[PDB]
Design a protein around this ligand. Structure first.
Ligand SMILES: CC1CCN(C(=O)c2cc3ccccc3o2)CC1
Ligand SMILES: [Cl-]
Ligand SMILES: [Zn+2]
Ligand SMILES: [Zn+2]
Length: 583
């Protein structure tokens, strides 16, 4: 307890000795409260004016406009699983880390890799120096990391504290993030959750492949496809989950092993967190369970634990084991022989991205196999605890990573599987920018990032192909796309480029696409088809409305408004790539 968190707690008390007070009005039951000190401090969503001026019909659609305006889950506790549950989880975790390790070598990530990440600008969740980029050069920072690092090898921790701010993001100081990245970065940096290595994973696949992947799961013999979301996944990670995740250190050696064992032991299985309570004060609270790590390591361990949970739900539906209460010795033998005999085949029946999953089990007994899943604390969202899962019968209706997928037949008979979501969501997200101080140039370059993503991923939506052409016509041709349209770890961001978008489309959808046999290049945007007119309207298209027809017909006036604001620059007209503007 305080033997592991004490140093951190006592160090904080000393930097706020003037203010320290053991309050009696602390709203913590499940979190252990330690003390409080004086604070005075808090970034809301800003609108992107380039995208808004070029999407005027949506200015009167509340689903779009409300996206730009702007607890009882973090302060709960999960029961400890039954003994049979613990046994299933240890055996499956042991086996899963062995499978993920067969063709990969755990290894430390480097200052250099971390330096390039911050220099290339990435979302690490950080807080003497003001910018992360500057701290990477001030050797004093690296001496602070060295100081901490040697404490970790001594099995102690001084500065690895969380700043808390169905979401809450646990920021840490850049040095705390370096040491996490050094010890566990390999999981993401070397693609341990790729489909090739994990069979169930989709890390680095890209949104152009997820649909083809769901269609390949559909080709397997079995029952419905199940996509049960969990109710607040990060808050349901048990210390037993944290202990099965830690068994990755069993595959490590030397310094690496000691560094990873201390991240698990001292930051994950024992946390210290500063919450900013308006009543304002800074509470120093602690706890052993729940997820609280870097977003990228959180993705990897979520995928791992979810892969484990879903194989165990599959075992339960196949009657590999009778009850979670206690596992017989012969049932343990059976679970292992099951894993050895068909583990890899059953991983390939899944697509898993963090807390999100699609399972095509052997048959529909999976639907009522709920005891292990509820007893692991992975309670399904929006359905009665003991009510059977509603499956899907068509892979084109299954939700995954906030998308559904359409089969789209090109004029030449070749078959695209394309991602899609309600168009109000796509336009509402492109109208939002994060953070302060953006120039008009930076704003335009973020608008251009969204526009190129739409041209590559959502070309089949009439309204997004037109708006993407308008935005690319309205931003200087040579200005480079900036920021991130998305942070999804499945994403590959082929739209972040100044290459010609028809050249990228051909590479992504034809040349590099293993589901396309005939590699005949497409020569024009007119060869590239749309969803049916009715399919387009069902997924939120404004085609057949008057506001939309005025917008499309007068698009060159909206393009000219934005060109006049940006000023006298080199622009290209992309509207003639569409038939209706081709004179
Ligand atoms: C649900 C149906 C969609 C097609 N309809 C149109 O009126 C239409 C098609 C179209 C294509 C491009 C620009 C405007 C457009 O309007 C009828 C209703
Ligand atoms: Cl269905
Ligand atoms: Zn530490
Ligand atoms: Zn759709």
């Amino acid at each position: 307890n305080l033997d592991i968190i004490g140093k951190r707690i006592e160090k904080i008390k000393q930097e706020h000795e003037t203010s320290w007070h053991y309050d009696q009005d602390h709203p913590y039951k499940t979190w252990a409260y330690h003390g409080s000190y004086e604070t005075k401090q808090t970034a809301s969503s800003m609108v992107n004016g380039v995208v808004r001026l070029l999407t005027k019909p949506w200015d009167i659609i509340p689903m779009v406009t409300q996206m730009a305006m702007t607890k009882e889950k973090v302060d709960t506790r999960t029961q400890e699983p039954k003994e049979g549950t613990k046994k299933l989880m240890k055996i499956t975790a042991e086996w899963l880390w062995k499978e993920l390790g067969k063709k990969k070598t755990p290894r430390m990530c480097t200052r250099e890799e971390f330096t390039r990440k911050v220099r290339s600008n990435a979302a690490l969740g950080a807080i003497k120096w003001k910018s992360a980029r500057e701290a990477v050069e001030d050797s004093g920072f690296w001496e602070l990391v060295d100081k901490e690092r040697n404490l970790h090898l001594e099995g102690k921790c001084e500065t690895c504290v969380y700043n808390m701010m169905s979401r809450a993001i646990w920021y840490m100081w850049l040095g705390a993030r370096f040491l996490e990245f050094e010890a566990l970065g390999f999981l993401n940096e070397d693609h341990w959750f790729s489909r090739e290595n994990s069979l169930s994973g989709v890390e680095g696949e890209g949104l152009h492949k997820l649909g083809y992947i769901l269609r390949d799961v559909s080709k397997k013999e079995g029952g419905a496809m199940y996509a049960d979301d969990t109710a607040g996944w990060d808050t349901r990670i048990t210390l037993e989950d944290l202990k099965n995740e830690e068994m990755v250190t069993n595959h490590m050696e030397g310094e690496h092993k000691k560094l990873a064992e201390a991240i698990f032991k001292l930051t994950y299985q024992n946390k210290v967190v500063r919450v900013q309570r308006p009543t304002t004060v800074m509470d120093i609270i602690s706890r052993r369970d729940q997820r609280g790590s870097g977003q990228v390591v959180t993705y990897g361990l979520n995928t791992f634990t979810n892969m484990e949970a879903q194989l165990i739900r599959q075992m339960e539906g196949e009657g590999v084991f009778k009850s979670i209460q206690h596992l017989t010795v012969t049932e343990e033998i059976a679970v292992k022989n099951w894993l050895v005999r068909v583990g890899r085949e059953r991983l390939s029946r899944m697509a898993i991205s963090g807390d999100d999953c699609v399972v095509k089990p052997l048959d529909d007994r999976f639907a009522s196999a709920l005891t292990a899943l509820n007893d692991m604390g992975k309670v399904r969202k929006d359905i009665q605890q003991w009510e059977p899962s509603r499956g899907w019968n068509d892979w084109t209706q299954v939700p995954f990573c906030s998308h559904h997928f359409h089969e789209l037949i090109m004029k030449d008979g070749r078959v695209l599987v394309v991602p899609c979501r309600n168009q109000d969501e796509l336009i509402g997200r492109a109208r939002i920018s994060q953070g302060a101080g953006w120039s008009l140039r930076e704003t335009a370059c973020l608008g251009k990032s969204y526009a190129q993503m739409w041209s590559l991923m959502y070309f089949h939506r009439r309204d997004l192909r037109l708006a993407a052409n308008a935005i690319c016509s309205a931003v200087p041709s040579h200005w480079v796309p900036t920021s991130r349209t998305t942070w999804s770890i499945h994403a590959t961001h082929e739209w972040m480029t100044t290459e010609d978008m028809l050249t990228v489309w051909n590479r992504v959808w034809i040349q590099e696409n293993p589901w396309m046999e005939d590699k005949t290049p497409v020569e024009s945007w007119e060869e590239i088809p749309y969803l049916g007119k009715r399919e387009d309207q069902w997924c939120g298209s404004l085609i057949g409305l008057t506001s939309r027809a005025t917008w499309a017909k007068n698009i060159q006036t909206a393009i000219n408004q934005v060109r006049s604001l940006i000023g006298n620059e080199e622009y290209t007209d992309y509207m003639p790539s569409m038939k209706r503007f081709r004179r």
